[PDB]
Amino acid sequence: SSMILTQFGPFIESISGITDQSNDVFEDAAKAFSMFTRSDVYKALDEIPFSDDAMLPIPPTIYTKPSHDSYYYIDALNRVRRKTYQGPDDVYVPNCSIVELLEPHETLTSYGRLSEAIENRAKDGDSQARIATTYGRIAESQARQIKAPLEKFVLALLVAEAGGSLYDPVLQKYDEIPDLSHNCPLWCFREICRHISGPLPDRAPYLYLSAGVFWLMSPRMTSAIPPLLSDLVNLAILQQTAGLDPSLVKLGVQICLHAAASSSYSWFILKTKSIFPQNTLHSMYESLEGGYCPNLEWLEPRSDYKFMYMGVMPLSAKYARSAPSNDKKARELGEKYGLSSVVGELRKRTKTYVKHDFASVRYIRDAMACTSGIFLVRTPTETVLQEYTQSPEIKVPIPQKDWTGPIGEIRILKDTTSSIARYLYRTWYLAAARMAAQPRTWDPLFQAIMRSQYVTARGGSGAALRESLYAINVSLPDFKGLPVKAATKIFQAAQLANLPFSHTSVAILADTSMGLRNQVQRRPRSIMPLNVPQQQVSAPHTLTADYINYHMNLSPTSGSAVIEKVIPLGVYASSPPNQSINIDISACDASITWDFFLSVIMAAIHEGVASSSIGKPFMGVPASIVNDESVVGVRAARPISGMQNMIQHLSKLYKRGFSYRVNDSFSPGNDFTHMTTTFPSGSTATSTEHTANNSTMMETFLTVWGPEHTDDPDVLRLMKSLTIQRNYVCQGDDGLMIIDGTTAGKVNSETIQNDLELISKYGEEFGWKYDIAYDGTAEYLKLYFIFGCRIPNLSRHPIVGKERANSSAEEPWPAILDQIMGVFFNGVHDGLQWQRWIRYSWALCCAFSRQRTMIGESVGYLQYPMWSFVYWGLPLVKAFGSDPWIFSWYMPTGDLGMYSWISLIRPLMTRWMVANGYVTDRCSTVFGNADYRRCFNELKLYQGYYMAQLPRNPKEVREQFTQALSDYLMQNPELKSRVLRGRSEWEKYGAGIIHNPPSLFDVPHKWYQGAQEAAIATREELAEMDETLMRARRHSYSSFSKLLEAYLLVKWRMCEAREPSVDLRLPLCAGIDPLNSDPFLKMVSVGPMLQSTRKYFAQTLFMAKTVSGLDVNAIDSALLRLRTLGADKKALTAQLLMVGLQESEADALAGKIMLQDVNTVQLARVVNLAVPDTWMSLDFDSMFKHHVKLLPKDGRHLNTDIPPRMGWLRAILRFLGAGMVMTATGVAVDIYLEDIHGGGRSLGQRFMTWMRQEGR
């Protein structure tokens, strides 16, 4: 596009596969991006000759909106509240005018901020002004839920799309993805915005600033415009990068337009977010006529979550959707929110898919990508008042007469009881007893670990803890003058370190400060962070819960990444013969209260733990005496253990309820403490606890309640065939009920429906509202599955979206780079069209790679070379004269990735350097006669490589602090004695061998550092970071890292492509089909990762956990390095003593390590090699084992042989080979070791040098 094509022409061709990429062009393009004014982006958009198919009616009511005033009021407690009109949910930001409340900005006369007068008038308690300030502040907060200005993302899209269709190297044809003239989201963006600016020279409807927003002073501007615009941009990019059906995309825009047309965008999106999934995913195959699905076997023990692929299951009518119909509800929702045309259009299209195949799952995926991806926002006041207000309705309470007299704070549940609580009790009692009986529980190291779990940089309600203690004349050290963020639990630990349990006890009842975090397609999550003393006392609860989840049930301990959400389980559960019910418990925290659960759980633990903990303190808490009115009449003083003493103090808090301090920053005058029985989300127990009750109640239902409430033979059979150990997987409030079918097909839908209704009624008995879904679909941990195929949900990963719950300003450049790289990796995992996605990312990165630096009137610029992004993981499109698109997005990160792409075109690079004057008489074992040193410096390859490795963020009372922390951790004398023994032992057997000895004595320093890096950076500090970056760019190098220089000595031969590991007609991941060549062939040739990645990697460490503050992978690395470096057994023993272990254990594990055959992944850590995040979804284990041959294609070579004592080389060598195979576009190929320049022996010594030199 002339304007665009004129300014980025050369760069546009370098990322389209037409021209080689070069830092000169990359950086020129970067300069061009930064010099582009916002209005120019809109002018560029004006040049696009949009097509009629990219247009649709834009509701005039989007622009003319009411005054915010009728949407708020002042309540009885003088809190600015949101006035409700559409219902209990209608509490978000309303769609109203905004210009009347702003004062023009000094320099940007066309933009304005909330009037200083209104705010000050609000600070002065005026009611009308408080309301206007609230609305103004919350509208802004809504507009800030993005990573950066939308104009950056649009400009990047224009620049990358000007490259036109992309030629697929494998399919050997150009893609047929429509050009921007057909992009309805973009057309809307341009039109809506143009209509708003009107005659104004400024085209941007609002400006996204570092801490706030300014709105274009147009009477046509609305508080709903930013969210609307943000959705459009995402949809614009996804249509070009995921190849989304343009027609499905228009439906999505329609929905957003309707949201802006309503009285509240966020609210409208919340009420209609189910449209696309319900009418596609949840209504597929009413008529199944064919296609294939996975046939997996769930290996034993089912708890390993390991699966094996056995082939494909031919689909027929026998498998058509049998679950309840949702047509009625689906159409009702549409009719009610003015979207029936969209519902019906979606229903009509869905019924046309009578075969389950790539085409159909892609259809679902596409549809599901259209849902708004905004991070919903509302004031903290509103979140508090809605999420902490109502308790659960216990329909069948525990009889009052079923409790004994008190034993301190608790009451025992009689065994006479008829309550079903009876079972909840036994289970926790049992677990507590076995937990407490474990010898490890009484190991000082174990207790240090439990005491360190909550010693972090995160807040722990510091202010309130200091006040509760102040009220009893217990003043904590201030550490006046220490450069650390005081509002951290690490700081809290330091303050409490030398105080007895008895002095801080009262803090257990102190207020809890509320936090907040916004979510996509969901209402705000509240964050109630307990303080150190509260977390300490919660240990018994947490431990018993872990014991249950570890020994008594089938449960996930997943994070937020797709790589750790046991994808394999979903495939299995959703694959016909099998069926899965998605069971969930809504309002979980508010349902785990004292009346039923907590009073029972506290008692069961307090009693089940009695004998094992008899006369000992625990984690710092002393034993004591409690009032005993247990047995009727008699009343004595009863001795209890430390562990019991904890439960004793915890019960008081649980029983009393929690006090949440709410400081609504967005609502002037909204400061208050709110009491509620709703469970804390920031307790070490929360998740594990909820997981334990989930499985316990489900178990009780399958064993007792259910069977006793029906005589239906079939329902009794179904129930009896299920077990929480084999058919029910849970985590927190989410659960998956997996019903293995049979040869005779799947279990009767009606029989399942009956047994689900029983579950529903059963929950009402103890206050749980089960959110059960039976729809032929599987849902668990936010991943969606149908017929064994994963459906990535693109709407949940907003490209421009970003969660900003507070008013603090965004992190300083270049933190945005990490976020952009994160956006890129989401695309890889979500399976976007690889070429279009790669090209786009390059444009996006380039658009953020340049930042203006100020140094006292000296205007300069920080510039990250294109090579820094390669290092971070972004694959090259074409360089050094190579063919285009030969590099896959599965190229590893850092050194391993650098090694991979370089090895792929090494000869080419050499040939290119000479052809361009980079020649020397000096011959290189890697680049021959190529003057690589002068080449890599001139094209900033070394600079980018080294710049990519710098931090992207600024960085007597000292002895006192570190010492306090030290006392906290080294509380128990036995632990210290262990570490010291290790130290004097390290001198004799380990010192000199390695210099990276991990040690408990390090924790205090690691913690101090953490409390420091948590504080806010100073202006000067930011400068030092920039200067560090500029220094690295100005310096000239002569080599890469020592490890990379060593890998480059290794050469390979790529041979025969691998045979398919799975059927080519089999849909595993929607979007990953024959139309997405690289990802598809990789999936097919390599094969999917069929085991939980947590369970897999948990097998690559000698020790699962350690003190919070040390790295388990680091300890595992130190041990393995000492072994490799020839150190003696006693040296590993010394290392293990320094990390808290007992001599007996130390000597044993150490002796075990000396003789163990370490697997590829675990041993590879000796040189810091890690399995790439992007590979986690594929069967990398198989690649290392059977597809990276270390015996040259034609036999043994002198240089390839592995020296007798260097068998550990094979591990490292496997990673290098796999690196090249995965980085090469197309099918995974068998790679064969061809050469090692100086031979294996010389190579091993080279790595040993690196090993012993670390931290020197």
Q: Which residues bind ligand GTG (CB under 6 A)?
A: 31, 34-35, 210, 810, 812-813, 850-854, 861, 1022, 1026
Residue 352 or 858: the one with the smaller Cβ distance to ligand GTG is: 858
Q: Pick one of Mn ion, ligand GTG, none as the site partner of residue 853 (Cβ within 5 to 8 A by kind).
A: ligand GTG
Which element (helix H / strand E) includes 583? strand 579-586
Q: How far is the CB of 823 from ligand GTG (least distance, A)?
A: 18
Q: Binding of Mn ion at residue 733 (CB under 5 A)?
A: no
Q: Which stretch binds Mn ion (CB under 5 A): 258-266, 579-587, 679-687, 1153-1161?
A: 579-587
Q: Pick one of ligand GTG, Mn ion, none as the site partner of residue 119 (Cβ within 5 to 8 A by kind).
A: none
Question: Cα–Cα distance between 812 and 821 in angstroms, integer?
Answer: 16
Which element (helix H / strand E) includes 1236? strand 1229-1236
Q: In Å, what is the CA distance from 504 to each residue of 424, 646, 833?
A: 32, 13, 57
DSSP secondary structure string, 641-663? -HHHHHHHHHHHHHHH-EEEEEE
Q: How far is the CB of 211 from ligand GTG (least distance, A)?
A: 8
Residue 209 or 509: the one with the smaller Cβ distance to ligand GTG is: 209
3-state secondary structure of 1203: coil
Name the amino acid, one letter, at 811: E
- Which residue's entry shows tokens 């930011």? 1022
Residue 1218, CB half-sphere, CA atoms under 13 Å: how many?
28
Residue 357 or 1026: the one with the smaller Cβ distance to ligand GTG is: 1026
Q: How far is the CB of 259 from Mn ion (least distance, A)?
A: 25
Residue 534 exposed, middle or buried by CB count within 10 Å (0-12, 13-18, 19+): buried
Q: Which stretch binds Mn ion (CB under 5 A): 181-189, 295-303, 621-629, 775-783?
A: 775-783
Q: Pick one of ligand GTG, Mn ion, none as the site partner of residue 110 (Cβ within 5 to 8 A by kind).
A: none
Q: Binding of Mn ion at residue 1230 (CB under 5 A)?
A: no
Residue 952 or 1053: the one with the smaller Cβ distance to ligand GTG is: 952
Q: How far is the CB of 1182 from ligand GTG (least distance, A)?
A: 44
Cα–Cα nearest to 731, from 777, 655, 782, 658: 782
Helix, strand, coil percentages, rounded to 5, for the chain: 50, 15, 35
The string over 600-630, giving b where at least 16 C-beta atoms fall within 10 Å of a residue's C-beta and e elsewhere, is bbbbbbbbbbbebbeeebbbbbebbebebbb
Residue 100 or 1024: the one with the smaller Cβ distance to ligand GTG is: 1024
Q: Which stretch binds Mn ion (CB under 5 A): 34-42, 467-475, 733-741, 1090-1098?
A: 733-741
Residue 953 or 1182: the one with the smaller Cβ distance to ligand GTG is: 953
Q: How far is the CB of 569 from Mn ion (least distance, A)?
A: 12
Residue 358, CB half-sphere, CA atoms under 13 Å: how many?
12
Question: Cα–Cα distance between 711 and 700 in angstroms, integer?
Answer: 17
Q: In Å, what is the CA distance from 89 to each residue of 372, 385, 1047?
A: 18, 11, 59
Q: Pick one of ligand GTG, Mn ion, none as the site partner of residue 684 (Cβ within 5 to 8 A by kind).
A: none
Report residue 704 as tokens.
Answer: 């007792």
Q: Pick one of ligand GTG, Mn ion, none as the site partner of residue 1229 (Cβ within 5 to 8 A by kind).
A: none
Q: Binding of Mn ion at residue 584 (CB under 5 A)?
A: yes
Q: How far is the CB of 780 from Mn ion (least distance, A)?
A: 6
Residue 537, CB half-sphere, CA atoms under 13 Å: how many?
25
Q: How far is the CB of 31 from ligand GTG (least distance, A)?
A: 4
Q: Pick one of ligand GTG, Mn ion, none as the site partner of residue 171 (Cβ within 5 to 8 A by kind).
A: none
Name the amino acid, one letter, at 119: E
Q: Which stretch binds Mn ion (CB under 5 A): 117-125, 427-435, 583-591, 612-620?
A: 583-591
Q: Please answer whether residues 548 and 696 qualify as being in contact, where contact means their C-beta atoms are separated by less than 8 angstroms.
A: yes
Q: Which residue is nearest to ligand GTG (CB)?
A: 34
Question: Cα–Cα distance between 566 and 580 in angstroms, integer?
Answer: 15
Cα–Cα nearest to 802, from 249, 189, 226: 226
Sign of CA dihedral 947, 1209, 1119, 992: negative
Question: Cα–Cα distance between 605 and 643 in angstroms, integer?
Answer: 10
Q: Please answer whether residues 891 and 842 qualify as being in contact, where contact means their C-beta atoms are separated by less than 8 angstroms.
A: no
Q: Pick one of ligand GTG, Mn ion, none as the site partner of residue 645 (Cβ within 5 to 8 A by kind).
A: none
Q: How far is the CB of 32 from ligand GTG (least distance, A)?
A: 8
Q: Pick one of ligand GTG, Mn ion, none as the site partner of residue 940 (Cβ within 5 to 8 A by kind).
A: none
Question: Cα–Cα distance between 801 and 227 in angstroms, integer?
Answer: 10
Residue 236 or 692: the one with the smaller Cβ distance to Mn ion is: 692
Residue 733 or 765: the one with the smaller Cβ distance to Mn ion is: 733
Q: How far is the CB of 733 from Mn ion (least distance, A)?
A: 8
Among 734, 803, 931, 1116, binds Mn ion (CB under 5 A): 734
Number of residues that bind Mn ion (CB under 5 A): 4
Name the amino acid, one letter, at 1036: S
Q: How far is the CB of 626 from ligand GTG (least distance, A)?
A: 56
Q: Which residue is nearest to Mn ion (CB)?
A: 734
Residue 952 or 1210: the one with the smaller Cβ distance to ligand GTG is: 952
Q: What would you report as the CA-atom Rg of the chain, rounded to the nearest whole angstrom?
A: 31
Kindly give, in sequence order, each residue whose CB lies less than 8 Å from that of residue 626, ignoring residues fewer than 6 positions away: 407, 408, 637, 638, 640, 648
Length of the chain as a residue count: 1256
Residue 206 or 307: the one with the smaller Cβ distance to ligand GTG is: 206
Q: Pick one of ligand GTG, Mn ion, none as the site partner of residue 812 (Cβ within 5 to 8 A by kind).
A: ligand GTG
Question: Cα–Cα distance between 1231 and 796 in angstroms, integer?
Answer: 38
Q: Binding of Mn ion at residue 775 (CB under 5 A)?
A: no
Question: Cα–Cα distance between 1189 and 1201 in angstroms, integer?
Answer: 12
529 phi, psi to nearest 5 deg:
-85, 110
Residue 35 or 308: the one with the smaller Cβ distance to ligand GTG is: 35
Residue 202 or 1026: the one with the smaller Cβ distance to ligand GTG is: 1026
Cα–Cα nearest to 872, from 818, 829, 828, 827: 818
Q: Pick one of Mn ion, ligand GTG, none as the site partner of residue 734 (Cβ within 5 to 8 A by kind).
A: Mn ion
Q: How far is the CB of 737 from Mn ion (least distance, A)?
A: 10
Residue 473 or 858: the one with the smaller Cβ distance to ligand GTG is: 858
738 phi, psi to nearest 5 deg:
-100, 115
Q: How far is the CB of 181 from ligand GTG (least distance, A)?
A: 29
Report residue 1203 as tokens.
Answer: 């020296």
Q: How far is the CB of 765 from ligand GTG (least distance, A)?
A: 54
Kindly give, in sequence order, each residue whose CB lies less than 8 Å from that of residue 693, ignoring residues fewer than 6 positions away: 424, 592, 597, 601
The DSSP bridge pattern shows strands 307-314 and 72-74 to be unpaired
Q: How far is the CB of 864 from ligand GTG (least distance, A)?
A: 12
Residue 22 or 1245: the one with the smaller Cβ distance to ligand GTG is: 22
Report residue 817 as tokens.
Answer: 């780079």
Q: How far is the CB of 38 from ligand GTG (least distance, A)?
A: 9
Q: How far is the CB of 66 from ligand GTG (least distance, A)?
A: 34
Q: How far is the CB of 584 from Mn ion (least distance, A)?
A: 4
Q: Pick one of Mn ion, ligand GTG, none as the site partner of residue 983 (Cβ within 5 to 8 A by kind).
A: none
Residue 782 or 852: the one with the smaller Cβ distance to ligand GTG is: 852
Q: Binding of Mn ion at residue 582 (CB under 5 A)?
A: yes
Q: Which stretch binds Mn ion (CB under 5 A): 38-46, 741-749, 777-785, 803-811?
A: 777-785
Question: Cα–Cα distance between 177 and 535 in angstroms, integer?
Answer: 54
Residue 855 or 915: the one with the smaller Cβ distance to ligand GTG is: 855
Return residues touching Mn ion (CB under 5 A): 582, 584, 734, 779
